[PDB]
Amino acid sequence: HHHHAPPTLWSRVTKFGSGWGFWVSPTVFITTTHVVPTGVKEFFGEPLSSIAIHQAGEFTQFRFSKKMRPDLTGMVLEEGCPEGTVCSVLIKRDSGELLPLAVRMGAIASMRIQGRLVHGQSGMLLLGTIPGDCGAPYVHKRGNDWVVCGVHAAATKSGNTVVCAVQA
Ligand SMILES: *[C@@H](O)[C@H](C[C@@H]1CCNC1=O)NC(=O)[C@H](CC1CCCCC1)NC(=O)OCC(C)(C)c1cccc(Cl)c1
């Protein structure tokens, strides 16, 4: 129904590097830093010169100088969700399957994950995440508008707790 992730929202989820990223708007693409390709001079055809790239705490944002997805409306990127919010992780698999995972979000905090400092939010799954799912967006529908508040970065060994990286 209307309040499940619509097809256009899923169409923002894009295979990228060793995971996924997400078109927040025609010009802004977000992902988790560790999936990003290394040593490239262009992204989606555009030279790095034309791209503002902001990377911190495992969150990466690309702001392009051209409309890359002109078909899309701009949506709100927030710095995480409030504790208790139920978000969906929009997981695409290479098979083509779409797997919206319901997650109850916890607190925003700094975490050390395999040596890297993550500006993260943990959440409890309400179906699990696997290697290759990173970059997948954490989204929720606030009244009439969809909000994106993080990108998938990690899961506990049990798989029952996930972490998304959030923007400063
Ligand atoms: C996506 O690349 C992958 C998704 C994970 C894999 C298994 N299920 C998932 O959801 N993410 C990772 O493998 C992640 C990579 C690090 C790399 C450096 C930057 C941060 C992300 N590692 C990971 O999830 O580690 C799992 C633990 C148990 C080692 C872990 C340690 C510390 C905190 C947590 Cl929540 C988990």
Spans of all domains in the chain: 1-74, 75-168
Substitution site in 113, 125, 138 for ligand 1 pocket (most atoms within 8 Å of beta carbon)? 113
Closest CA to 32 of 124, 129, 126: 129
Tokens of 125: 């799954």
Beta strands in the chain, from DSSP E residues, in sequence order: 13-16, 19-23, 28-32, 42-43, 46-47, 51-56, 59-64, 76-77, 86-92, 98-113, 116-125, 137-142, 145-155, 161-165
Per-residue burial over 65-82, b = 16 or more CB atoms within 10 Å of its CB, e = otherwise: eeebbeebeebebeebbe
Q: Are 24 and 77 in contact (CB under 8 A)?
A: yes
User: 156 CA to middle of ligand 1, Å?
Assistant: 7
Substitution site in 134, 151, 160, 163 for ligand 1 pocket (most atoms within 8 Å of beta carbon)? 134
**Please, what is the end-to-end C-alpha distance for the chain in angstroms?**
33
The count of other CB atoms within 10 Å of the CB of residue 128 is 13
User: 154 CA to middle of ligand 1, Å?
Assistant: 3
Residue 37 is classified by DSSP as: P
Determination approach: X-ray
User: 130 CA to middle of ligand 1, Å?
Assistant: 9
Query: Which amino acid, 41?
Result: K
Residue 100 is classified by DSSP as: E
Query: Diameter of the chain by CA atoms?
Result: 43
Please give the positions annotated as active site: 34, 58, 134
Residue with tokens 């499940």: 4
C-alpha atoms less than 13 angstroms from C-alpha of 137 in its C-beta half-sphere: 30
Q: Are 134 and 27 in contact (CB under 8 A)?
A: no
What atom of ligand 1 comes closest to residue 154's alpha carbon? 24
